[PDB]
């Protein structure tokens, strides 16, 4: 169960050999919860599997308190823990360059708050970067929090599919 205004985050991160569900958190901004292992998933996973772990993973997200914060936004800490979960991929999937990990890898985010899901696709702009450029609002794919988990694997698996470069 989700609370009434509170928002909820989650990452996507897709290749030819995983899907990734991820919860960020953060407090306005968000980012990679190191707390969580991502979610990841066969790059083939059905919808049933896709929106059970979309439901998890946004379950976990978290709003900081204002201690919490200066720890968690640390610059040092953070770049490690970026490097790191690209060495995990690469380690795990057996990618031998960060080129052959991101070059295909689309991104999107999926915001939960007051019942209502949105994902929203990307452009995939340079190798480490993604942005909302050339991406309407109509480009969301929006569905109830209630939703069965069927119904929110499609609705990621129709925003990826409206990810673009």
Same mark, same amino acid.
């Given at each position: %169960?989700? =609370?009434?205004? !509170?928002?909820?985050?989650?990452?996507?991160? #897709?290749?030819?050999?995983?899907? #990734?569900?991820?919860?960020?958190?953060?407090?306005?901004?968000?980012?990679?919860? /190191?707390?969580? /292992?991502?979610? +990841? +998933? /066969? @790059?083939?996973?059905? $919808? !049933?599997?896709?929106?059970?772990?979309?439901?998890?993973?946004?379950? =976990? #997200?978290?709003?900081?308190?204002?201690?919490?914060?200066?720890?968690?936004?640390?610059?040092?800490?953070?770049?490690? !823990?970026?490097?790191?979960?690209?060495a995990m991929l690469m380690e795990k999937y057996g990618y031998?360059?960060?080129?052959?990990?991101?070059?295909? %890898?689309? $991104?999107?985010?999926?915001?939960?708050? =007051?019942?209502?899901?949105?994902?929203? @696709?990307?452009?995939?702009?340079?190798?480490?970067?993604?942005?909302?450029?050339?991406?309407?609002?109509?480009?969301?794919?929006?569905? @109830?929090?209630?939703?069965? @988990?069927?119904?929110?694997?499609?609705?990621?698996?129709?925003?990826?599919?409206?990810?673009?470069?």
């Open positions: %169960m989700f =609370n009434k205004d !509170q928002d909820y985050w989650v990452s996507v991160y #897709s290749t030819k050999d995983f899907l #990734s569900v991820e919860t960020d958190s953060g407090l306005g901004r968000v980012r990679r919860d /190191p707390l969580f /292992p991502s979610h +990841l +998933l /066969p @790059p083939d996973a059905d $919808n !049933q599997t896709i929106g059970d772990a979309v439901l998890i993973a946004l379950s =976990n #997200s978290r709003t900081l308190s204002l201690e919490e914060s200066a720890d968690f936004f640390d610059l040092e800490t953070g770049k490690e !823990q970026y490097a790191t979960w690209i031998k360059t960060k080129r052959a990990l991101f070059k295909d %890898m689309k $991104n999107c985010s999926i915001h939960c708050i =007051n019942d209502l899901i949105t994902i929203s @696709p990307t452009r995939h702009e340079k190798l480490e970067a993604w942005s909302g450029r050339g991406i309407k609002e109509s480009d969301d794919v929006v569905i @109830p929090a209630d939703s069965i @988990p069927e119904e929110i694997g499609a609705a990621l698996r129709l925003a990826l599919s409206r990810c673009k470069g």
